[PDB]
PDB file of C-alpha atoms and ligand atoms in Angstrom:
ATOM      1  CA  UNK A   1    -106.180  69.619  88.543  1.00  0.00           C
ATOM      2  CA  UNK A   2    -109.254  71.620  87.589  1.00  0.00           C
ATOM      3  CA  UNK A   3    -109.159  75.130  86.250  1.00  0.00           C
ATOM      4  CA  UNK A   4    -110.292  77.944  88.620  1.00  0.00           C
ATOM      5  CA  UNK A   5    -112.712  80.475  87.490  1.00  0.00           C
ATOM      6  CA  UNK A   6    -111.493  83.807  88.771  1.00  0.00           C
ATOM      7  CA  UNK A   7    -113.448  86.836  89.979  1.00  0.00           C
ATOM      8  CA  UNK A   8    -112.344  90.100  88.546  1.00  0.00           C
ATOM      9  CA  UNK A   9    -111.474  91.476  91.975  1.00  0.00           C
ATOM     10  CA  UNK A  10    -109.198  88.616  92.817  1.00  0.00           C
ATOM     11  CA  UNK A  11    -106.508  89.874  90.331  1.00  0.00           C
ATOM     12  CA  UNK A  12    -105.040  93.083  89.138  1.00  0.00           C
ATOM     13  CA  UNK A  13    -102.981  93.595  86.129  1.00  0.00           C
ATOM     14  CA  UNK A  14     -99.859  95.752  86.584  1.00  0.00           C
ATOM     15  CA  UNK A  15     -98.258  96.080  83.165  1.00  0.00           C
ATOM     16  CA  UNK A  16     -98.328  94.845  79.634  1.00  0.00           C
ATOM     17  CA  UNK A  17     -95.717  92.411  78.528  1.00  0.00           C
ATOM     18  CA  UNK A  18     -96.746  91.837  74.846  1.00  0.00           C
ATOM     19  CA  UNK A  19     -99.258  92.767  72.213  1.00  0.00           C
ATOM     20  CA  UNK A  20    -100.649  90.283  69.652  1.00  0.00           C
ATOM     21  CA  UNK A  21    -103.539  90.114  67.196  1.00  0.00           C
ATOM     22  CA  UNK A  22    -104.965  87.177  69.108  1.00  0.00           C
ATOM     23  CA  UNK A  23    -104.474  88.782  72.497  1.00  0.00           C
ATOM     24  CA  UNK A  24    -102.453  91.184  74.584  1.00  0.00           C
ATOM     25  CA  UNK A  25    -100.497  89.673  77.543  1.00  0.00           C
ATOM     26  CA  UNK A  26    -100.155  91.403  80.847  1.00  0.00           C
ATOM     27  CA  UNK A  27     -98.063  90.957  83.915  1.00  0.00           C
ATOM     28  CA  UNK A  28    -100.281  90.842  86.989  1.00  0.00           C
ATOM     29  CA  UNK A  29    -100.715  90.121  90.648  1.00  0.00           C
ATOM     30  CA  UNK A  30    -103.410  87.718  91.724  1.00  0.00           C
ATOM     31  CA  UNK A  31    -104.678  87.368  95.200  1.00  0.00           C
ATOM     32  CA  UNK A  32    -106.828  84.151  95.659  1.00  0.00           C
ATOM     33  CA  UNK A  33    -110.115  84.547  97.507  1.00  0.00           C
ATOM     34  CA  UNK A  34    -109.631  83.224 100.984  1.00  0.00           C
ATOM     35  CA  UNK A  35    -105.866  83.421 100.829  1.00  0.00           C
ATOM     36  CA  UNK A  36    -103.451  86.002 102.287  1.00  0.00           C
ATOM     37  CA  UNK A  37    -100.703  85.189  99.801  1.00  0.00           C
ATOM     38  CA  UNK A  38    -100.286  87.200  96.563  1.00  0.00           C
ATOM     39  CA  UNK A  39     -99.021  85.538  93.472  1.00  0.00           C
ATOM     40  CA  UNK A  40     -97.422  87.158  90.343  1.00  0.00           C
ATOM     41  CA  UNK A  41     -99.220  85.997  87.298  1.00  0.00           C
ATOM     42  CA  UNK A  42     -99.107  86.310  83.602  1.00  0.00           C
ATOM     43  CA  UNK A  43    -102.510  87.279  82.192  1.00  0.00           C
ATOM     44  CA  UNK A  44    -103.637  86.894  78.539  1.00  0.00           C
ATOM     45  CA  UNK A  45    -106.725  88.709  77.433  1.00  0.00           C
ATOM     46  CA  UNK A  46    -108.262  87.611  74.099  1.00  0.00           C
ATOM     47  CA  UNK A  47    -108.446  90.717  71.907  1.00  0.00           C
ATOM     48  CA  UNK A  48    -111.977  90.321  70.351  1.00  0.00           C
ATOM     49  CA  UNK A  49    -114.692  88.339  68.552  1.00  0.00           C
ATOM     50  CA  UNK A  50    -116.263  86.634  71.416  1.00  0.00           C
ATOM     51  CA  UNK A  51    -118.849  84.033  70.114  1.00  0.00           C
ATOM     52  CA  UNK A  52    -120.972  81.428  71.752  1.00  0.00           C
ATOM     53  CA  UNK A  53    -119.353  78.753  69.591  1.00  0.00           C
ATOM     54  CA  UNK A  54    -115.971  80.422  70.115  1.00  0.00           C
ATOM     55  CA  UNK A  55    -116.523  80.624  73.846  1.00  0.00           C
ATOM     56  CA  UNK A  56    -117.203  76.902  74.193  1.00  0.00           C
ATOM     57  CA  UNK A  57    -114.145  76.051  72.050  1.00  0.00           C
ATOM     58  CA  UNK A  58    -111.975  78.342  74.145  1.00  0.00           C
ATOM     59  CA  UNK A  59    -113.347  76.807  77.382  1.00  0.00           C
ATOM     60  CA  UNK A  60    -112.671  73.335  76.211  1.00  0.00           C
ATOM     61  CA  UNK A  61    -109.111  73.979  75.423  1.00  0.00           C
ATOM     62  CA  UNK A  62    -108.711  75.912  78.671  1.00  0.00           C
ATOM     63  CA  UNK A  63    -109.668  72.812  80.704  1.00  0.00           C
ATOM     64  CA  UNK A  64    -107.028  70.710  79.026  1.00  0.00           C
ATOM     65  CA  UNK A  65    -104.320  73.354  79.550  1.00  0.00           C
ATOM     66  CA  UNK A  66    -105.239  73.244  83.206  1.00  0.00           C
ATOM     67  CA  UNK A  67    -105.199  69.551  83.259  1.00  0.00           C
ATOM     68  CA  UNK A  68    -101.498  69.225  82.191  1.00  0.00           C
ATOM     69  CA  UNK A  69     -99.086  68.423  84.961  1.00  0.00           C
ATOM     70  CA  UNK A  70     -95.320  68.529  84.136  1.00  0.00           C
ATOM     71  CA  UNK A  71     -92.354  70.342  85.618  1.00  0.00           C
ATOM     72  CA  UNK A  72     -91.299  71.667  82.224  1.00  0.00           C
ATOM     73  CA  UNK A  73     -94.742  72.217  80.926  1.00  0.00           C
ATOM     74  CA  UNK A  74     -96.685  75.297  81.725  1.00  0.00           C
ATOM     75  CA  UNK A  75    -100.145  74.885  83.240  1.00  0.00           C
ATOM     76  CA  UNK A  76    -103.041  77.254  83.050  1.00  0.00           C
ATOM     77  CA  UNK A  77    -103.988  78.237  86.580  1.00  0.00           C
ATOM     78  CA  UNK A  78    -107.263  79.790  85.846  1.00  0.00           C
ATOM     79  CA  UNK A  79    -109.617  81.713  83.610  1.00  0.00           C
ATOM     80  CA  UNK A  80    -111.731  84.883  84.321  1.00  0.00           C
ATOM     81  CA  UNK A  81    -115.054  85.370  82.647  1.00  0.00           C
ATOM     82  CA  UNK A  82    -116.549  88.782  82.095  1.00  0.00           C
ATOM     83  CA  UNK A  83    -117.059  90.905  79.032  1.00  0.00           C
ATOM     84  CA  UNK A  84    -113.671  89.716  77.812  1.00  0.00           C
ATOM     85  CA  UNK A  85    -111.824  86.455  78.268  1.00  0.00           C
ATOM     86  CA  UNK A  86    -108.701  86.536  80.326  1.00  0.00           C
ATOM     87  CA  UNK A  87    -106.404  83.525  80.956  1.00  0.00           C
ATOM     88  CA  UNK A  88    -104.277  83.343  84.096  1.00  0.00           C
ATOM     89  CA  UNK A  89    -100.977  81.579  84.006  1.00  0.00           C
ATOM     90  CA  UNK A  90     -98.269  81.699  86.744  1.00  0.00           C
ATOM     91  CA  UNK A  91     -95.687  84.207  85.819  1.00  0.00           C
ATOM     92  CA  UNK A  92     -92.221  83.230  84.644  1.00  0.00           C
ATOM     93  CA  UNK A  93     -89.982  86.005  85.916  1.00  0.00           C
ATOM     94  CA  UNK A  94     -87.131  85.623  83.470  1.00  0.00           C
ATOM     95  CA  UNK A  95     -89.304  85.624  80.263  1.00  0.00           C
ATOM     96  CA  UNK A  96     -88.783  83.886  76.997  1.00  0.00           C
ATOM     97  CA  UNK A  97     -85.682  81.719  76.658  1.00  0.00           C
ATOM     98  CA  UNK A  98     -84.864  83.269  73.337  1.00  0.00           C
ATOM     99  CA  UNK A  99     -84.842  86.716  74.847  1.00  0.00           C
ATOM    100  CA  UNK A 100     -82.756  85.444  77.821  1.00  0.00           C
ATOM    101  CA  UNK A 101     -80.018  83.958  75.685  1.00  0.00           C
ATOM    102  CA  UNK A 102     -79.897  86.997  73.436  1.00  0.00           C
ATOM    103  CA  UNK A 103     -79.085  89.512  76.268  1.00  0.00           C
ATOM    104  CA  UNK A 104     -77.033  86.917  78.307  1.00  0.00           C
ATOM    105  CA  UNK A 105     -75.013  85.546  75.449  1.00  0.00           C
ATOM    106  CA  UNK A 106     -71.656  86.482  76.951  1.00  0.00           C
ATOM    107  CA  UNK A 107     -72.189  84.689  80.341  1.00  0.00           C
ATOM    108  CA  UNK A 108     -74.129  81.512  79.276  1.00  0.00           C
ATOM    109  CA  UNK A 109     -72.547  78.112  79.846  1.00  0.00           C
ATOM    110  CA  UNK A 110     -72.633  74.773  78.028  1.00  0.00           C
ATOM    111  CA  UNK A 111     -74.051  72.988  80.983  1.00  0.00           C
ATOM    112  CA  UNK A 112     -76.937  75.258  81.312  1.00  0.00           C
ATOM    113  CA  UNK A 113     -77.519  75.179  77.631  1.00  0.00           C
ATOM    114  CA  UNK A 114     -77.287  71.366  77.364  1.00  0.00           C
ATOM    115  CA  UNK A 115     -79.537  71.091  80.385  1.00  0.00           C
ATOM    116  CA  UNK A 116     -82.200  73.314  78.709  1.00  0.00           C
ATOM    117  CA  UNK A 117     -82.431  70.937  75.754  1.00  0.00           C
ATOM    118  CA  UNK A 118     -83.035  68.008  78.078  1.00  0.00           C
ATOM    119  CA  UNK A 119     -85.811  69.934  79.828  1.00  0.00           C
ATOM    120  CA  UNK A 120     -87.472  70.841  76.588  1.00  0.00           C
ATOM    121  CA  UNK A 121     -87.375  67.303  75.433  1.00  0.00           C
ATOM    122  CA  UNK A 122     -88.733  66.106  78.693  1.00  0.00           C
ATOM    123  CA  UNK A 123     -91.547  68.701  78.386  1.00  0.00           C
ATOM    124  CA  UNK A 124     -92.174  67.605  74.900  1.00  0.00           C
ATOM    125  CA  UNK A 125     -92.367  64.044  75.857  1.00  0.00           C
ATOM    126  CA  UNK A 126     -95.219  64.707  78.214  1.00  0.00           C
ATOM    127  CA  UNK A 127     -97.116  66.329  75.536  1.00  0.00           C
ATOM    128  CA  UNK A 128     -96.606  63.372  73.240  1.00  0.00           C
ATOM    129  CA  UNK A 129     -97.800  61.104  76.073  1.00  0.00           C
ATOM    130  CA  UNK A 130    -100.785  63.233  76.477  1.00  0.00           C
ATOM    131  CA  UNK A 131    -101.466  63.329  72.691  1.00  0.00           C
ATOM    132  CA  UNK A 132    -100.879  67.004  72.312  1.00  0.00           C
ATOM    133  CA  UNK A 133     -99.104  68.518  69.439  1.00  0.00           C
ATOM    134  CA  UNK A 134     -97.561  71.873  70.272  1.00  0.00           C
ATOM    135  CA  UNK A 135     -97.626  73.032  66.536  1.00  0.00           C
ATOM    136  CA  UNK A 136     -95.341  76.016  67.249  1.00  0.00           C
ATOM    137  CA  UNK A 137     -92.295  75.038  69.159  1.00  0.00           C
ATOM    138  CA  UNK A 138     -89.898  77.877  69.278  1.00  0.00           C
ATOM    139  CA  UNK A 139     -87.293  79.660  71.389  1.00  0.00           C
ATOM    140  CA  UNK A 140     -89.832  82.351  72.272  1.00  0.00           C
ATOM    141  CA  UNK A 141     -92.342  79.784  73.464  1.00  0.00           C
ATOM    142  CA  UNK A 142     -90.008  78.366  76.067  1.00  0.00           C
ATOM    143  CA  UNK A 143     -90.202  80.337  79.294  1.00  0.00           C
ATOM    144  CA  UNK A 144     -87.494  80.706  81.903  1.00  0.00           C
ATOM    145  CA  UNK A 145     -88.789  80.277  85.413  1.00  0.00           C
ATOM    146  CA  UNK A 146     -85.166  80.342  86.558  1.00  0.00           C
ATOM    147  CA  UNK A 147     -81.816  79.688  84.711  1.00  0.00           C
ATOM    148  CA  UNK A 148     -81.896  76.049  86.114  1.00  0.00           C
ATOM    149  CA  UNK A 149     -85.546  75.527  85.342  1.00  0.00           C
ATOM    150  CA  UNK A 150     -87.413  76.158  82.129  1.00  0.00           C
ATOM    151  CA  UNK A 151     -90.939  75.435  80.872  1.00  0.00           C
ATOM    152  CA  UNK A 152     -92.960  75.358  77.626  1.00  0.00           C
ATOM    153  CA  UNK A 153     -96.133  77.349  76.996  1.00  0.00           C
ATOM    154  CA  UNK A 154     -98.687  78.151  74.251  1.00  0.00           C
ATOM    155  CA  UNK A 155     -98.998  74.679  72.954  1.00  0.00           C
ATOM    156  CA  UNK A 156    -102.145  73.303  71.577  1.00  0.00           C
ATOM    157  CA  UNK A 157    -103.438  76.299  69.555  1.00  0.00           C
ATOM    158  CA  UNK A 158     -97.353  81.315  60.451  1.00  0.00           C
ATOM    159  CA  UNK A 159     -93.836  80.384  61.719  1.00  0.00           C
ATOM    160  CA  UNK A 160     -92.795  78.787  58.367  1.00  0.00           C
ATOM    161  CA  UNK A 161     -89.124  78.656  59.239  1.00  0.00           C
ATOM    162  CA  UNK A 162     -89.729  76.639  62.451  1.00  0.00           C
ATOM    163  CA  UNK A 163     -92.258  74.231  60.980  1.00  0.00           C
ATOM    164  CA  UNK A 164     -91.407  70.932  59.290  1.00  0.00           C
ATOM    165  CA  UNK A 165     -91.398  70.546  55.496  1.00  0.00           C
ATOM    166  CA  UNK A 166     -94.155  68.037  55.696  1.00  0.00           C
ATOM    167  CA  UNK A 167     -96.356  70.479  57.602  1.00  0.00           C
ATOM    168  CA  UNK A 168     -95.608  73.221  55.200  1.00  0.00           C
ATOM    169  CA  UNK A 169     -96.151  71.289  52.039  1.00  0.00           C
ATOM    170  CA  UNK A 170     -99.286  69.446  53.102  1.00  0.00           C
ATOM    171  CA  UNK A 171    -100.491  71.044  56.249  1.00  0.00           C
ATOM    172  CA  UNK A 172     -99.738  67.958  58.295  1.00  0.00           C
ATOM    173  CA  UNK A 173     -98.828  68.200  61.919  1.00  0.00           C
ATOM    174  CA  UNK A 174     -97.686  65.399  64.163  1.00  0.00           C
ATOM    175  CA  UNK A 175     -95.401  64.654  67.124  1.00  0.00           C
ATOM    176  CA  UNK A 176     -92.680  63.887  64.621  1.00  0.00           C
ATOM    177  CA  UNK A 177     -93.347  67.217  62.840  1.00  0.00           C
ATOM    178  CA  UNK A 178     -92.887  68.921  66.300  1.00  0.00           C
ATOM    179  CA  UNK A 179     -89.455  67.306  66.492  1.00  0.00           C
ATOM    180  CA  UNK A 180     -88.374  69.111  63.419  1.00  0.00           C
ATOM    181  CA  UNK A 181     -89.517  72.285  65.135  1.00  0.00           C
ATOM    182  CA  UNK A 182     -87.657  71.152  68.291  1.00  0.00           C
ATOM    183  CA  UNK A 183     -84.375  70.900  66.285  1.00  0.00           C
ATOM    184  CA  UNK A 184     -84.890  74.411  65.067  1.00  0.00           C
ATOM    185  CA  UNK A 185     -85.488  75.598  68.619  1.00  0.00           C
ATOM    186  CA  UNK A 186     -82.219  74.013  69.722  1.00  0.00           C
ATOM    187  CA  UNK A 187     -80.453  75.747  66.889  1.00  0.00           C
ATOM    188  CA  UNK A 188     -81.730  79.078  68.164  1.00  0.00           C
ATOM    189  CA  UNK A 189     -80.282  78.401  71.597  1.00  0.00           C
ATOM    190  CA  UNK A 190     -76.991  77.210  70.088  1.00  0.00           C
ATOM    191  CA  UNK A 191     -76.707  80.289  67.810  1.00  0.00           C
ATOM    192  CA  UNK A 192     -77.623  82.562  70.731  1.00  0.00           C
ATOM    193  CA  UNK A 193     -80.799  83.867  69.168  1.00  0.00           C
ATOM    194  CA  UNK A 194     -79.826  84.420  65.603  1.00  0.00           C
ATOM    195  CA  UNK A 195     -82.844  84.258  63.343  1.00  0.00           C
ATOM    196  CA  UNK A 196     -82.964  81.084  61.178  1.00  0.00           C
ATOM    197  CA  UNK A 197     -82.531  81.789  57.451  1.00  0.00           C
ATOM    198  CA  UNK A 198     -82.026  85.492  58.159  1.00  0.00           C
ATOM    199  CA  UNK A 199     -83.029  87.676  55.206  1.00  0.00           C
ATOM    200  CA  UNK A 200     -84.744  84.780  53.393  1.00  0.00           C
ATOM    201  CA  UNK A 201     -88.355  85.015  52.157  1.00  0.00           C
ATOM    202  CA  UNK A 202     -90.835  82.580  53.588  1.00  0.00           C
ATOM    203  CA  UNK A 203     -91.913  81.290  50.195  1.00  0.00           C
ATOM    204  CA  UNK A 204     -88.404  80.280  49.287  1.00  0.00           C
ATOM    205  CA  UNK A 205     -87.900  78.117  52.362  1.00  0.00           C
ATOM    206  CA  UNK A 206     -89.853  75.216  51.130  1.00  0.00           C
ATOM    207  CA  UNK A 207     -87.767  74.808  48.009  1.00  0.00           C
ATOM    208  CA  UNK A 208     -84.518  74.932  49.957  1.00  0.00           C
ATOM    209  CA  UNK A 209     -85.630  72.109  52.138  1.00  0.00           C
ATOM    210  CA  UNK A 210     -86.422  70.078  49.038  1.00  0.00           C
ATOM    211  CA  UNK A 211     -82.875  70.899  47.878  1.00  0.00           C
ATOM    212  CA  UNK A 212     -81.379  69.468  51.024  1.00  0.00           C
ATOM    213  CA  UNK A 213     -80.049  72.712  52.276  1.00  0.00           C
ATOM    214  CA  UNK A 214     -80.177  73.030  56.046  1.00  0.00           C
ATOM    215  CA  UNK A 215     -79.431  75.725  58.592  1.00  0.00           C
ATOM    216  CA  UNK A 216     -75.610  76.125  59.264  1.00  0.00           C
ATOM    217  CA  UNK A 217     -73.987  74.172  61.985  1.00  0.00           C
ATOM    218  CA  UNK A 218     -73.304  76.447  65.007  1.00  0.00           C
ATOM    219  CA  UNK A 219     -69.679  77.339  65.761  1.00  0.00           C
ATOM    220  CA  UNK A 220     -70.186  76.572  69.491  1.00  0.00           C
ATOM    221  CA  UNK A 221     -71.306  72.942  69.210  1.00  0.00           C
ATOM    222  CA  UNK A 222     -69.366  69.724  68.610  1.00  0.00           C
ATOM    223  CA  UNK A 223     -69.867  67.587  65.481  1.00  0.00           C
ATOM    224  CA  UNK A 224     -71.965  64.981  67.307  1.00  0.00           C
ATOM    225  CA  UNK A 225     -74.544  67.384  68.461  1.00  0.00           C
ATOM    226  CA  UNK A 226     -75.019  68.874  64.983  1.00  0.00           C
ATOM    227  CA  UNK A 227     -75.954  65.512  63.770  1.00  0.00           C
ATOM    228  CA  UNK A 228     -78.849  65.380  66.220  1.00  0.00           C
ATOM    229  CA  UNK A 229     -80.188  68.660  64.821  1.00  0.00           C
ATOM    230  CA  UNK A 230     -79.773  67.347  61.304  1.00  0.00           C
ATOM    231  CA  UNK A 231     -81.643  64.178  62.155  1.00  0.00           C
ATOM    232  CA  UNK A 232     -84.626  66.276  63.232  1.00  0.00           C
ATOM    233  CA  UNK A 233     -84.751  68.058  59.886  1.00  0.00           C
ATOM    234  CA  UNK A 234     -84.540  64.908  57.810  1.00  0.00           C
ATOM    235  CA  UNK A 235     -87.494  64.418  55.381  1.00  0.00           C
ATOM    236  CA  UNK A 236     -88.654  61.183  56.571  1.00  0.00           C
ATOM    237  CA  UNK A 237     -90.704  61.957  59.672  1.00  0.00           C
ATOM    238  CA  UNK A 238     -90.318  58.416  61.008  1.00  0.00           C
ATOM    239  CA  UNK A 239     -86.572  58.651  60.417  1.00  0.00           C
ATOM    240  CA  UNK A 240     -86.420  61.591  62.969  1.00  0.00           C
ATOM    241  CA  UNK A 241     -85.395  60.799  66.530  1.00  0.00           C
ATOM    242  CA  UNK A 242     -88.117  60.235  69.113  1.00  0.00           C
ATOM    243  CA  UNK A 243     -88.440  62.793  71.959  1.00  0.00           C
ATOM    244  CA  UNK A 244     -87.801  60.130  74.548  1.00  0.00           C
ATOM    245  CA  UNK A 245     -84.752  59.129  72.575  1.00  0.00           C
ATOM    246  CA  UNK A 246     -83.726  62.839  72.500  1.00  0.00           C
ATOM    247  CA  UNK A 247     -83.725  63.069  76.202  1.00  0.00           C
ATOM    248  CA  UNK A 248     -81.278  60.245  76.630  1.00  0.00           C
ATOM    249  CA  UNK A 249     -78.778  61.672  74.052  1.00  0.00           C
ATOM    250  CA  UNK A 250     -78.774  65.116  75.610  1.00  0.00           C
ATOM    251  CA  UNK A 251     -78.580  63.811  79.194  1.00  0.00           C
ATOM    252  CA  UNK A 252     -75.441  61.813  78.227  1.00  0.00           C
ATOM    253  CA  UNK A 253     -74.116  65.066  76.573  1.00  0.00           C
ATOM    254  CA  UNK A 254     -75.098  66.996  79.621  1.00  0.00           C
ATOM    255  CA  UNK A 255     -72.755  64.906  81.869  1.00  0.00           C
ATOM    256  CA  UNK A 256     -69.709  66.366  80.042  1.00  0.00           C
ATOM    257  CA  UNK A 257     -70.842  69.522  78.285  1.00  0.00           C
ATOM    258  CA  UNK A 258     -67.334  70.823  77.629  1.00  0.00           C
ATOM    259  CA  UNK A 259     -66.477  67.952  75.275  1.00  0.00           C
ATOM    260  CA  UNK A 260     -69.633  68.162  73.132  1.00  0.00           C
ATOM    261  CA  UNK A 261     -70.022  71.978  73.311  1.00  0.00           C
ATOM    262  CA  UNK A 262     -67.037  74.400  73.035  1.00  0.00           C
ATOM    263  CA  UNK A 263     -67.558  78.132  73.770  1.00  0.00           C
ATOM    264  CA  UNK A 264     -65.012  80.650  75.019  1.00  0.00           C
ATOM    265  CA  UNK A 265     -63.491  79.438  78.293  1.00  0.00           C
ATOM    266  CA  UNK A 266     -65.288  77.079  80.526  1.00  0.00           C
ATOM    267  CA  UNK A 267     -64.403  74.721  83.444  1.00  0.00           C
TER     268      UNK A 267
HETATM  269  O1  LIG B 301    -102.542  80.680  78.276  1.00  0.00           O
HETATM  270  C1  LIG B 301    -101.831  80.709  77.411  1.00  0.00           C
HETATM  271  N1  LIG B 301    -100.817  81.733  77.304  1.00  0.00           N
HETATM  272  C2  LIG B 301    -100.646  82.798  78.223  1.00  0.00           C
HETATM  273  N2  LIG B 301     -99.982  83.977  78.084  1.00  0.00           N
HETATM  274  C3  LIG B 301    -100.058  84.724  79.256  1.00  0.00           C
HETATM  275  C4  LIG B 301    -100.834  84.138  80.281  1.00  0.00           C
HETATM  276  S1  LIG B 301    -101.322  82.670  79.702  1.00  0.00           S
HETATM  277  C5  LIG B 301    -101.859  79.672  76.362  1.00  0.00           C
HETATM  278  C6  LIG B 301    -101.393  78.379  77.060  1.00  0.00           C
HETATM  279  C7  LIG B 301    -101.220  78.334  78.447  1.00  0.00           C
HETATM  280  C8  LIG B 301    -100.676  77.175  79.078  1.00  0.00           C
HETATM  281  F1  LIG B 301    -100.551  77.254  80.407  1.00  0.00           F
HETATM  282  C9  LIG B 301    -100.433  76.118  78.355  1.00  0.00           C
HETATM  283  C10 LIG B 301    -100.542  76.189  76.982  1.00  0.00           C
HETATM  284  C11 LIG B 301    -101.054  77.211  76.326  1.00  0.00           C
HETATM  285  O2  LIG B 301    -101.080  77.273  74.966  1.00  0.00           O
HETATM  286  N3  LIG B 301    -103.252  79.387  76.063  1.00  0.00           N
HETATM  287  C12 LIG B 301    -104.166  78.544  76.644  1.00  0.00           C
HETATM  288  C13 LIG B 301    -105.498  78.740  75.978  1.00  0.00           C
HETATM  289  C14 LIG B 301    -106.813  78.072  76.122  1.00  0.00           C
HETATM  290  C15 LIG B 301    -107.891  78.480  75.463  1.00  0.00           C
HETATM  291  C16 LIG B 301    -107.796  79.531  74.502  1.00  0.00           C
HETATM  292  C17 LIG B 301    -106.566  80.146  74.327  1.00  0.00           C
HETATM  293  C18 LIG B 301    -105.466  79.710  75.048  1.00  0.00           C
HETATM  294  C19 LIG B 301    -103.980  80.213  75.127  1.00  0.00           C
HETATM  295  O3  LIG B 301    -103.499  81.024  74.427  1.00  0.00           O
END
């Protein structure tokens, strides 16, 4: 439930997974005080600019992150306060889903792929229920705990291609706007990590959306599935399918993946 405050001694950071302007992420081992067991963890350290106002804002968000409780939604285990701010999240061994599909493109299966979409939709629904807008749904932001299990992280805090036209044009973010991002995320999985609008300038993208052009239907997927992706990118936000609704369609599709999705040779 609550977010633990962690003593510096409690955890050690083994290696650095990623570097960002906002913060640098590390892979680490955390041993809870009073517990024999050692847990692998992902640690994020804010790069700079600590401010009293900033610290309060950061803390406030941290509590909510800790509060979230869903199987497909990442939860912030704890925060460590010292000179720098570090956020502790349980490590996902596999890494980002986008990276996973990219190096495992040859061996992936439709059932796994269809199942991932359902899981993301389920995760998204919890956020909608909790009145949280992710604001940056992407393939990278989906973490692979295991092939069978996937989770969503970094919600609640630009990626022009991923974001909805409404958001781009008027800086408007809503759950429906997140659905447009969700459709793009599905496209990434379907296309095995191909970058959307590859070689296209960010500035141009808004005009293209206005023109009705959309990302190309993936070779692997069936016609019905492509329609779901298109629905997400439709201009009317209300017209776009609800997340709860999305779960049902994918789940039905999940039962017989081969019909809906055709890739290589599969059972
Ligand atoms: O912790 C996060 N990412 C990490 N990378 C390596 C280890 S944790 C990320 C986050 C974690 C989570 F469980 C769920 C949603 C999230 O958005 N958060 C949370 C938070 C709170 C206050 C200020 C900044 C951040 C921030 O960046």
